[PDB]
Amino acid sequence: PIELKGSSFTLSVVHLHEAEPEVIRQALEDKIAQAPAFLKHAPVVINVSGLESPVNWPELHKIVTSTGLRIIGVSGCKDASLKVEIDRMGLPLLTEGKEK
């Protein structure tokens, strides 16, 4: 009645780099206008490896979703208390594979 399998999926990953909350919002909006086919309502993994601790995750989360991007999970997290904040929302942490 129920079967558990592994599978490869090709997901879009938004690599965030250290910047002011308003600069991030602006950059995301500009990218959605530039690439509407790829980014309008896009389900995405958020890569936070380019961010510097401490990350204000409730704020960043609200900025990303405010743009319509649907956050699948978060990759590149090393910081322990950033992990706690991500789990509090119940978002998966994910491990990336080869570029696709």
Added chain:
Amino acid sequence: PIELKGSSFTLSVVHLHEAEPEVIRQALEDKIAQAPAFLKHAPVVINVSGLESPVNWPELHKIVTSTGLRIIGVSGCKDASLKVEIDRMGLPLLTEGKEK
């Protein structure tokens, strides 16, 4: 400030087969007890290709999440009104790749 990339992820996929709502719940619980490491709170893609139209998605959704599985997206959907019901929740439809 922001970079868009493609990447491969290996996600767990729960292949659902046509069965009574209560039989599905039972099977999911048994699988969580059998394989707790792989399935307790597991983020998962739900494959509905083994299901027969019409699917009662609000009901099935509530049964799957009731067990603690976190639904990443849904794969194998062909039925058009099942797609509508899935989008109403804002869940991504996903395309599977090679077994991993």
